[PDB]
């Protein structure tokens, strides 16, 4: 139903998203999560900041350099939340994760290509109105990730370059809507409508 299924984190929930992205892999379904940074969790911020640092104090004894490597970059922050549900050892896994690609923001060559959303993992469709809820972004920032800015800016730029596009397009489909609107009514038409079209 589509070789690749670029998703857009923007307004999702680490866990649910993940999960569903998981299944999709183990069942041969390439994926590519974007805008990672603008992901979402549940519960105040000070929360996720703890339920993490703890994950930070981790580290191995004798050699801290060989223990739980604490990735800051969101993309990763989330990639973990995922590799956590995927045997990520037995070849069946490796085979998966090998089917993923979590980017922070939306770099080419996807920018130019449609995306989607997992309706079963939206802050706005799971979280009871007005209720604390992180935003990875900050969360990452607060714990290392040194780029929230770059993407940020280097983002707005993307939205431009596009927004501009749309216009051209929207301004295009404005014609069609007419072309048919007019070329409508005629005969050949009527008929179709009958059958449904």
């Amino acid at each position: 139903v589509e070789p690749v299924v670029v998703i857009d984190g923007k307004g999702h929930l680490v866990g649910r998203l993940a999960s569903v992205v998981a299944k999709q892999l183990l069942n041969g379904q390439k994926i590519v999560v974007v805008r990672a940074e603008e992901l979402n969790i549940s519960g105040e911020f000070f929360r996720n900041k703890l339920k993490y640092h703890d994950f930070l104090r981790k580290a191995t004894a004798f050699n801290k350099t060989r223990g739980p490597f604490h990735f800051r970059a969101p993309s990763r922050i989330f990639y973990k939340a995922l590799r956590g549900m995927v045997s990520h050892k037995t070849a069946r896994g490796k085979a998966a994760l090998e089917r993923l690609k979590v980017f922070e923001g939306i770099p080419p060559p996807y920018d130019k290509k449609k995306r989607v959303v997992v309706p079963q993992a939206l802050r706005v469709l799971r979280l009871k109105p007005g209720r604390k809820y992180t935003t990875l972004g900050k969360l990452s920032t607060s714990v290392g990730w040194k780029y929230e800015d770059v993407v940020a800016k280097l983002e707005a730029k993307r939205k431009v370059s596009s927004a501009e596009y749309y216009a051209k397009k929207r301004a295009f489909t404005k014609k069609v809507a007419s072309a048919n609107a007019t070329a409508a009514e005629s005969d050949v038409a009527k008929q179709l409508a009958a059958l449904g079209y």
Partner: protein, 333 residues
Amino acid sequence: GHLGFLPRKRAASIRARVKAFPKDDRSKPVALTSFLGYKAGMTTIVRDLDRPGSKFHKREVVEAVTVVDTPPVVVVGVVGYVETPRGLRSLTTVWAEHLSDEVKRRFYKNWYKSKKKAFTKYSAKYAQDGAGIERELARIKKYASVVRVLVHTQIRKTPLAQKKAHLAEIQLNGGSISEKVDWAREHFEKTVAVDSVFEQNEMIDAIAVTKGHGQRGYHSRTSINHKIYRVGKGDDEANGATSFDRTKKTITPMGGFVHYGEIKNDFIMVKGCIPGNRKRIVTLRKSLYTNTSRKALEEVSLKWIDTASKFGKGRFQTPAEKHAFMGTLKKDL
């Protein structure tokens, strides 16, 4: 000892690289951020100290300083660096077409056998009204937040027989990136002076690789806050002459420095002691910020410069002082 300087291991090169650079002031026009030279000797300075509220206010103070030999450094290229989620990234470097024999020598480990085919087809790529060169300059003119300049040492002017030009990178803190690349456009192949980066009475910082002994030594160290006392000029005679002393002499001691020759070019006289030893390359940066204390405020009045023979001992300054005291000898007449 100090846990921070770990791993206490050997540096990658003799020319250490500057990890950071000063921030930015966009309101200013284009200016360089750092400058390179060679450490050469340790001279004695006495001067009246115009430091307010001191135990040594308006009194004469002795202190040992170092003279870094700094030739006029010449640009041979310019680089653009984009801002990424993964840090910085060099998207394009571009070069100055007519490079010296010295920079061409840097690109080979064996210069003697080499057919000297350095920037041949790249110079042939230039050979038109631009088209490819001006395209890559436009590439940096569009993207790339930070713009760095490729420069090298005029080693022939230096009395050292090393004959191999050190390439370094120096960014620009003069805002609007269009002006950065247009400054670099005007300044391809051009020799940049020493006094056109630093002045006297400025706090600076030097980077160097520290005097190896046996593992102990040969690390890259950065010491900060050092006052430039004198920015000298080789073409100007009487560099050792102050406003007070005014005796026509070079800052160079009698028969050159200890393990270093004469100073036939520009120099910087830095307070205290720079890391590394003589014959070593250093790179002087400009403090990263406005370091406003009263240690920075005072404009110094250099009273006298010691130019006695450090090789052994010295009771004289010029060779003129030797025969003035000794009179005349056997081999003379």
